[PDB]
Structure 1
Amino acid sequence: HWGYGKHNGPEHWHKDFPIAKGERQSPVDIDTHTAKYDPSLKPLSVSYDQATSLRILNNGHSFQVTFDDSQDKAVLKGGPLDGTYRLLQFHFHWGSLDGQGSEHTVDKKKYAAELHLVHWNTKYGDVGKAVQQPDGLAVLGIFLKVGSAKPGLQKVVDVLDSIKTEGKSADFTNFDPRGLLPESLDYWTYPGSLTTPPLAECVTWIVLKEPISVSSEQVLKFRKLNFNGEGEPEELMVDNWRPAQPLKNRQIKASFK
């Protein structure tokens, strides 16, 4: 199946998922001088006070923290969105070195990593239905740069040796995703897609302008994870990012002047 190496990486994905060459693929480069300020954009509403985390999982392409989405516990609203979207999971994309790893770029600048908080539109009832709709998901993207440690990330870092290889999972209850957010919720937004297969064109992307800082020790622990399952030749889970895709007939809008 698909992955991030020479022979199964993003250049190959269109063969099994031909929407890879579609009209609203993600990620994209955010040209900040071309993105237009929209004064009609509302502030984001991030309501995570009741978030209920469940598990942390190595899925062979990232690690994921999954939440209870059977109720409106942790929801994203406002911004460019109409309706309520429930937080299902978050995961990251990162590099083998600090100068690459993010999926979106800002004036061609690459961050060391990128956090994706994945939400689905409750009017579609479940995420499987939502992925089939052009407004089915909203992914909140947050850049990571290397500098000071992010204290709200360390509980995640602490447990990664227990899910080194594909298929391993662990209890990861009582995690507060509010500890991963930057101060500002100013954002860019465009219509796009999932950045891994099935690459469905179902995502309103909301990318925050302010990155969070993480320490070199924290990102080091990401780079120690493995794509392989246990017992297979060890291939470090690094550079699990899709490069920027053609913007085509899309405009990126900014919530801030």
Structure 2
Amino acid sequence: GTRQSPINIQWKDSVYDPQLAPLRVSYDAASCRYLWNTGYFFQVEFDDSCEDSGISGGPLGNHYRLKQFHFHWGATDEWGSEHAVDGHTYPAELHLVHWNSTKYENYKKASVGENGLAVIGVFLKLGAHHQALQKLVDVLPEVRHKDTQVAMGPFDPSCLMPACRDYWTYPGSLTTPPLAESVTWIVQKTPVEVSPSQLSMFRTLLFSGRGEEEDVMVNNYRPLQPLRDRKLRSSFR
């Protein structure tokens, strides 16, 4: 395994690649479906048949379809993010996962193939109350046990991203099994603020199903993996 995520994003190792095309993000909100507890974190699932919903530009050769998005977090506000910036970790991290619709026939096989997925990573930090996030925070009480679902209405994932879209990018892997190295990571440089009360609600979920011992959902992040010999390109000077 020589391309594992996450990594400590260090400025001293990043190189500005001016030839990076702008990143075009446009998601079809009406394709949102359900929110569910996976046993690890909670995901928000979308209908990826709508080729219109997805991502392109940046370091991608073509358009990648939005499949789902999840978050990672810790037992306290001091830690929880998977990536670190200069060795600094944030209380949480959102992951928008998109798949290669031209190279792969479906998401299952994109997930494990070379250049099969493209994931945007957004750090979350404490600050102001975040309006759009609240739509999700609001249904968490119905998805406390593993494998449990809730229906979701229209939700636009772009509303979770920051205004400043500067990012770093590098070839990596999934941070969950099987840890396939099928991912083009697009880590946004600027974090979005959420309130502690919103973030607190996240630690209310459980790793356990119903009937089992109460096993709280916290510290669902993978430890830092070394860059090895990877080119960590920045889209900003």
With the length of structure 1 as denominator, give the TM-score of the two structures: 0.90
Residue number in structure 2 paired with 1:153: 133
2:53 & 2:235 partners in 1: Cα distance? 22
What is the Cα deviation at residue 197 of structure 1?
Answer: 0.2
Structure 1 residue 49, shift from structure 2 partner: 4.3
Deviation at 1:131, TM superposition (A): 2.1
Match of 1:81 in 2: 60
Correspondent of 2:181 among 201, 220, 237: 201
Superposition map of 1:1-257 within 5 A: 22-123=1-102, 124-257=104-237
Matches of 1:165 and 1:214, distance apart in 2? 24
**Runs of at least 4 residues of structure 1 off by over 4 A?**
none
SS at match of 1:155: helix
The alignment yields a C-alpha RMSD, in angstroms, of 1.0
Q: Distance in 2 between matches of 1:72 and 1:101?
A: 33
Alignment deviations for residues 133-166 of structure 1 (CA, whole Å, 9 cap, x no partner): 2211000000000111111100100000000010
Question: What runs of 5+ residues in structure 1 fail to find an aligned partner?
Answer: 1-21
Deviation at 1:94, TM superposition (A): 0.4
Aligned 8 A contact 2:29 2:154 in 1: no
- % identity of equivalent residues: 53
Of residues 174-183 and 114-123 in structure 1, the stretch that sits farther from structure 2 once superposed is: 174-183
Encode CA deviations 1:50-109: one digit per residue, 9 max, x unaligned.
Answer: 551001000100000000001213211000011110000000000111111000100000
Deviations 1:181-237 (A, max 9, x none): 100111100000000001001000000001000000000000111111111111110
Kindly indicate which of the two structures has a greater share of residues assigned to strand: 2
> How many residues are aligned here?
236
CA–CA separation in structure 2 for the residues paired with 1:104 and 1:189? 12
Contact 2:29 2:157 in 1 (8 A): no
TM-score where L is the length of structure 2? 0.97
* SS in structure 1 at match of 2:112: coil
Question: Structure 1: how far apart are the matches of 2:8 and 2:127?
Answer: 23
Q: Which runs of 5+ in 2 are unaligned?
A: none
